[PDB]
């Protein structure tokens, strides 16, 4: 999408059964709990143009991607059927919708509202991942904060009563630094810069205690053969495997099936609880036979993975399952 994303957007938020705007001063900060209908207005190549993205938070629930649907359907008779029309799950966002932020990364908060709750309310003390992609586009995805939540590969914001520290991990590029840094300014928090390893202790106190994180040699890695992962299952009556796009998340693996994830220097074989015994033992074969035309095979359970296989992914929930 060769527009440059700087046209008129209005975004709101799926509340109940209607979308209800969203403060315009927060364009860009999305709560992952939430789904939002973005009516984005433009004009490239002396054509105007509208799309509408309906955007699905990760822990939006079902309710509200009903609700989403009719709304959309709403909104598109309103308009005299003119947009295009586009559905986006957080971490698979296009490049043009990322661009729509003025170069801000996208902010997920956890939380959102519901009928029932209402609004939540922000925690006190918070943890953010900022990752960035192949092509610069940054999310920054808040998380526990726990000290394993940490991974060497990104930098993440800690905010908490009394400070805020940004911690840039060994394999973090500029433009999850650059990231972190936005987050801050919408926190209004003036940070600590700390780089992995020289950690000081109010970093680790503010965590709940120091502790291992998610880390290996290539999560480390500055330079970056970028990690991918796999889709594997005989659910449609003979054995394949189909590879995952988009950022990595943990709603990506599939508990009825076997996952690879090849970070180049090394396999993983993620096997989900509800995946047949055939499913793991031919991504096994599939995995020595994808090696060997051209490095450690590391056999992972749903809910026992190890920290250097969950530091690919872009938040992790240990009660997701
Ligand atoms: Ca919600
Ligand atoms: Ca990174
Ligand atoms: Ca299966």
Not at 106 to 128: D, N, W
């Amino acid at each position: 999408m060769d527009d440059d994303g700087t046209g008129q957007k209005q975004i709101w938020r799926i509340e109940g059964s209607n979308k209800v705007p969203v403060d315009p001063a927060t364009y860009g900060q999305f709560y992952g709990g939430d789904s939002y209908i973005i009516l984005y207005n433009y004009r490239h190549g002396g054509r105007q143009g509208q799309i509408i993205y309906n955007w699905q938070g990760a822990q939006s629930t079902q309710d509200e991607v009903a609700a989403s649907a009719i709304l959309t359907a709403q909104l598109d008779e309103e308009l005299g059927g003119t947009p295009v029309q586009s559905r986006v799950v957080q971490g698979k966002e296009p490049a043009h919708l990322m661009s729509l932020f003025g170069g801000k990364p996208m902010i997920i908060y956890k939380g959102g509202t519901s009928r029932e709750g209402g609004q939540t309310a922000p925690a006190s003390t918070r943890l953010f991942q900022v990752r960035a992609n192949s092509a610069g586009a940054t999310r920054a995805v808040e998380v526990l904060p726990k000290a394993g939540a940490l991974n060497s590969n990104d930098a993440f914001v800690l905010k908490t009563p009394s400070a805020a520290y940004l911690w840039v991990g060994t394999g973090a590029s500029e433009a999850e630094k650059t990231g972190a840094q936005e987050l801050l300014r919408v926190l209004r928090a003036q940070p600590v810069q700390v780089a992995e390893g020289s950690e000081p202790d109010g970093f680790w106190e503010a965590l709940g205690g120091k502790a291992a994180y998610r880390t290996s040699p290539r999560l480390k890695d500055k330079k970056m053969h970028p990690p991918r992962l796999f889709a594997c299952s005989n659910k449609i009556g003979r054995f394949v495997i189909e590879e995952v796009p988009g950022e990595l998340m943990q709603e990506d693996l599939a508990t009825d099936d076997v996952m690879l994830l090849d970070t180049w220097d090394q396999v993983f074989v993620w096997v989900g609880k509800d995946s047949q015994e055939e499913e793991k033992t031919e991504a096994l074969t599939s995995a020595k036979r994808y090696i060997e035309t051209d490095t450690p095979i590391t056999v992972v359970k749903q809910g026992f993975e190890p920290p250097s296989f969950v530091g690919w992914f872009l938040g992790w929930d240990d009660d997701y399952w």
